[PDB]
Amino acid sequence: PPRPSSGELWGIHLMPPRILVECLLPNGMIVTLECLREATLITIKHELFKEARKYPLHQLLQDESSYIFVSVTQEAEREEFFDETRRLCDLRLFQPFLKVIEPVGNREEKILNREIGFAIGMPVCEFDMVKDPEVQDFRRNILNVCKEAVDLRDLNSPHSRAMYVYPPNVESSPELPKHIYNKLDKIIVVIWVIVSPNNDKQKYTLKINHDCVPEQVIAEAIRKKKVCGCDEYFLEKYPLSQYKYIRSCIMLGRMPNLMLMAKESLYSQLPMDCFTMPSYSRRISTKSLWVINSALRIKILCATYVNVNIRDIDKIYVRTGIYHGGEPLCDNVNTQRVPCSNPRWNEWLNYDIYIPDLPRAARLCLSICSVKGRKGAKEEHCPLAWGNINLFDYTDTLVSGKMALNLWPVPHGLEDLLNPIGVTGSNPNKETPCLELEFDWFSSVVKFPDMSVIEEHANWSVSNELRENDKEQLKAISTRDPLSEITEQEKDFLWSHRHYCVTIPEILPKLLLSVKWNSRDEVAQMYCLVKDWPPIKPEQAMELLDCNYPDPMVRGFAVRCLEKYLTDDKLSQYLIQLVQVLKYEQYLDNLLVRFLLKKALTNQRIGHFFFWHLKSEMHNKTVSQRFGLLLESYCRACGMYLKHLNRQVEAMEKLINLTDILKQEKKDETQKVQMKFLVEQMRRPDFMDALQGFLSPLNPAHQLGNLRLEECRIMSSAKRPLWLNWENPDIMSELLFQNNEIIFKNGDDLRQDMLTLQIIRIMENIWQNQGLDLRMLPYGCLSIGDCVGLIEVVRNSHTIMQIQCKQFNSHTLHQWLKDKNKGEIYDAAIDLFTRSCAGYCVATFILGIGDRHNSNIMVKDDGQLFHIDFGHFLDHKKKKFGYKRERVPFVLTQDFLIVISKGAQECTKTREFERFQEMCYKAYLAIRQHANLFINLFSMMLGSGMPELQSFDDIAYIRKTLALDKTEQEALEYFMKQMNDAHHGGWT
Amino acid sequence: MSLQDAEWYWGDISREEVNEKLRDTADGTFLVRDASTKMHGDYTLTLRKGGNNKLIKIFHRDGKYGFSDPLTFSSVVELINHYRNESLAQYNPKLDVKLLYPVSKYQQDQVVKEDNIEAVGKKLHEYNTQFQEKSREYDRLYEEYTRTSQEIQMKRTAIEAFNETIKIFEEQCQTQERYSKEYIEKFKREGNEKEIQRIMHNYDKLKSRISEIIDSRRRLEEDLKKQAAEYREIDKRMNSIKPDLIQLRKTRDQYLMWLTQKGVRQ
Ligand SMILES: C[C@H]1OC(=O)N(c2cc(-c3cnc(N)nc3C(F)(F)F)nc(N3CCOCC3)n2)[C@H]1CO
User: Where are the residues of the annotated region Activation loop (chain A)?
Assistant: First the structure.
């Protein structure tokens, strides 16, 4: 099992400077040895064998070099310590003892599995103990993806391996928006070159065409004679302006201070990676479902126990249901009601569905519920434990025989009696309620029919005719939002015109909802239409991967749309949702997980966040096995980056352990005592080795070199966040950033913050590409574990309340922006403050962000305004107080309006305020035009576990703020009225 | 007949509100509401069929109403009256269902039992205070639920580590017994009795260390035994507060809705 805590010993967060270690010699003798906490295993083994001479049977001991150490780790693993250069305090020992053994077996296989096990947070030897055939078939059959990606990686010279480690950070299109191009002279790049012997850099300025390939850039550099500060490399022939650093330098101004170096300087520093086929790769009369002429029935046998006091609850019963995604294929069927003390039913449940009509993704969703009727006519039902199982296994076999299913706790906030969105399979915690089932037997193994037989029934069932407005109504249906109401008349209309729908491929999601999935006739016909369905935009294919589209060919079409049209920028942009929808997949081996892993193994910047998104949920037992197996396959084939990730992991584990000490053992001690402690362990040797010289998990292109301990401090929160500082070790840290800063917090869930900042960045990309220079600040925020995460620090940023000190006046904020931007820069700081206010005023209203105040709003020196702490979004105040209203979280008080109007009295009547409203209306309608994208992004997070995003009702909040059931003019009227009622007039 | 007096008719109720009224209902459960387009001229019949909520638009042209052309009925009630006694399978197959079970605003108002607006506001302030107190009780109890569940998992892991540790130390005994059996015989004839005492002293040293580790696991096992029982009682109080907290929030939201509907609007 994974590690309980992160201390150096069980129940001990930090070993004393000296500690006694019981040493078990191979001759039976036990030697108590005193060791320094940071002593290496080479030293300990040498001292033990010199001391062993003072004990009986020393003649039996071989040479010291013929042995290694073994002990029990806090993961309860029997780890062999082959890397003897490791310190005693870094072994994560359970108890302070060491066993001396001869090393047997494969040293390379055992060392790699140790590093993979450390990276994923659990020993990979636990995967070996899993008897589940799908788990073992997944570990074996996934190496197909692993073998390929390493081949393509080393296929081409040292260039193909450079495309992996340092991929290009480019936009999805070189087509330059109209307002960004007007910032060019019909591009000045300053290239600094480290010329030996001094390796200093000479400033060389060049005015070159924007569409010039990076090679065309070095051509002008040679005729006239890498991004500075981070590890981003222009190694592909993409137009220079398409690179995300260059594209950012045009809009923001400032000079793209790039750098040129020799290929031999970087290609040689690139180590060669090799995938080694593991030790588990070399190990260990049907009927068609359409031939079974009977209805579906499942026998609920009995359950072991339930936790409910009999004085408060009447009876219990097992509620079941046959589900296809989120919808039931038939009416839910309950068992009879029995006492809580006798959880026995032995009862067949008859479902209203023909067995051949069962779709491929048919699932059984069940739960044990308590029914109590002591008050009024209404009786209250409460789910006690739930469980889902796929009626077909990963080999298309219909489930038969008896089955034991350990159930899951009802997640917090879920009020439905069933949990159809929950994961499938049994709870590995066997100290839970266990329900016994029995599926029917049909004289042989029942398999789902082949795709050749599917097209047979479809060609028999199918065995010009359109009107002008009917084609216009089809277009109107496709344009609706994914959560808009579809009537039964509109379902029959869509299904009647399925073949014309191909002319407009974006209607496919609405068409799939019009299919009777409890009927194989319409389902088989739908298969043939999606096989040759033309591909849709990736943003629309992602909807076909959420919880409402479970069919394999539907999801296979979506993956094939991403395989050809999803750019690496967009895949890296939507990776959060793409990882979350893996939880919806029926099986471990699917086309989506293969596409993500294949992309993660060929692109390291994608593979980086692919690792951390999976690693951050390994604590979650509902997905720990799926994400653990997937992380195992990734760490085997990711090459050298496994070493760098382990540097990141061990750096995080020390921050977690340190913050744990401050929140528990040292919580009631003062700030001064906590800081002297805080610096003390930071000056320890092991801490510096692990906490320095590693890539920032917020951005692997950022190198966190040496720590600046004088700028590190404990923040004044109950969870004690750590404000940390590293120097940028790049040869020109002055060009991009010097002194990198990151906030480490261990205690609060940062997934809502991480999601909101992703949406804020996505909104800004919509505005910029449509000619709106609304500058947000979506800083980095990454969840790395259970309520553990990182936060990027915006340099030279200050809160409004910090400004209102150095009590204050309504003009204090305006005067500060003039004192920090005196002279000509004032007219650009006002523009930045104005364009950043419009972006956050529109974004926070749409998303329903938690209320803003003088500490939630921050302003940079150049005037860029931005918000921090997005702990609540959507209708978070709904369940607390049942008010049905849409809040305006960011109310531009008099302080902000004075700044926008350049200090003009009566700010609601200036030309600057009218242009401020014009951008808000442009921003509001722009996001409303892409409303389907944002609905789908929230829809893909429904199974994550975030509290304010559990049902589609939670997503319905943005359907109100965007007023989707109204016209575009009607919605803009709604936005003006909401801005009017919040600012007490002015918006007309 | 009568218009707008229909118990199954509701004004600006949301589909999310219809879902809560049709959740877990039987086939035939229905209600009519204004169309979500808010055009106020069209309505939407919501029918429960096969575990799903089917939305059936009621088109309106001239003075005729119906589900599809031709529109024949004269009142939206007359359309509901007709199918309340006849099946919808004629209008469309895959229905085979009639508008049998009707959600009624009479039993909807059955919660708010106050007359004067002051009594509803006075009662709303009572249920609100009770709901906040019941919620703070549930949130604190859920925190103990999560912490107890997490600590139980840590104890089970440490108990597994104790099992593996005790195995290794017991392997050390069997290893010492194998290597000693012929070496204590070689010292017996050679009269190195003190060397035998050294071997026996280290064996007592080994058995004493094992006896400590076995007792440390036994103390952690009885700790896990108590905490697993504490979790079971926390789990029961969760399943007792949960259903009462829901209806307490529902009663609260019903009084707040009464106050809005009885107050001035638009
Ligand atoms: C007055 C300070 O006291 C804070 O707590 N500050 C914070 C808090 C947070 C933050 C955000 N979100 C969540 N969830 N938590 C936290 C927290 F845990 F760190 F508090 N972020 C920043 N930023 C990050 C962005 O760049 C600027 C600095 N400053 C400072 C504000 O100036």
Answer: 867-893
- Output the ligand 1 site: residues, CB below 6 A: A 715, 717, 721, 743, 745, 750, 753, 779, 791, 793-794, 797, 799, 858, 868-869
Give CA–CA dist A763/A927, Å, rounded: 7
Question: A790 vs A530, A746, A854, CA distance in Å?
Answer: 42, 9, 23
**Is the separation of the CB atoms in A600 and A610 below 8 Å?**
yes
- The closest alpha carbon to A458, from A550, A551, A534, A520, belongs to A520
SS3 B118: helix
Q: Kindly provide the residue ranges of all beta strands, DSSP E only, lying in A498-585, ordered along the sequence.
A: none
Which residues in A538-673 belong to E strands, given as ranges? none
Alpha-carbon span A454 to A448, nearest angstrom:
10
Give the Å distance between the CA of A867 and the centre of ligand 1. 10
CATH of domain A286-447: 2.60.40.150
A554, A544 in Cβ contact below 8 A?
Answer: yes
CA distance B103 to B106: 9
Residues in chain B: 266
Boundary-marking domain end, from B47, B80, B109: B109
| Closest Cβ opposite residue A492 in set B92, B128, B135 | B92
Element (H, E) at A298: strand A295-303
CA A691–ligand 1 middle distance (angstroms): 22
Helix (H, G, I), strand (E, B) or coil at A594: helix
CA proximity to A810, closest of A899, A908, A910: A899
Q: Please answer whether residues A708 and A742 qualify as being in contact, where contact means their C-beta atoms are separated by less than 8 angstroms.
A: no
Contact A80, A98 (CB under 8 A): no
Spatial separation of the C-alpha atoms in residues A910 and A907, rounded to whole Å: 6
Handedness of CA A642, A645, A649, A655 (dihedral sign): positive
What pairs with residue B65 in β-bridges? B60, B73
Angle between helices A911-929 and A931-939 (to 10 degrees): 60
Is B189 part of any domain?
yes
The Cα–Cα gap between B212 and B222 comes to 16
Can you spell out the DSSP letters for A696-738?
Answer: ETTEEEEEE-SB-GGG-EE-SSTT--EEEEE---STTTTTS-S
Mutate to test the interface with B, among A3, A10, A79 (most CBs of B within 10 A): A10
| Residue that terminates a domain, selected from B109, B125, B146 | B109
Q: How far apart are CA A425 and CA A625, in angstroms?
A: 11
Q: Taking each helix axis from N to C terminus, what angle separates A825-847 and A911-929, rounded to the nearest 10 degrees?
A: 40
Q: Does the distance separating the beta carbons of B239 and A28 come in below 8 Å?
A: no
Q: Please report the atom of ligand 1 found closest to the CA of residue A721.
A: 18
Q: Which two three-digit tokens encode residue A159?
A: 């260039």
Burial of A705 (0-12, 13-18, 19+ CB in 10 A): middle
Both structure tokens of A955: 């997503």
Residue position matching structure tokens 């004075």 = A898
CB A755 within 8 A of CB A843: no
Same-domain pairing of B91 and B130 = no
Residue with the two structure tokens 């507060």: B241
CA angle, corner A291, sides to A285 and A295, nearest 5? 120
Measured CA to CA in angstroms, residue A348 lies from A324, A383, A747, A874 at distances of 21, 21, 47, 43
Contacts of B57 in chain A (CB under 8 A): 487, 489-490
The CATH number corresponding to A451-644 among 1.25.40.70, 3.40.50.10140, 2.40.50.140, 3.40.1550.10 equals 1.25.40.70
Task: Supply A182's token pair.
Answer: 């007007």
A407: its two tokens: 């159930």
Q: Report the distance separating Cα A696 and Cα A705, nearest Å.
A: 9
Å from CA of A791 to ligand 1 middle: 8
Q: How far apart are the first and last CA of chain A?
A: 62
Structure tokens that stand for A288 in this block = 């068609």
B181 and B201 both lie in a single domain:
yes
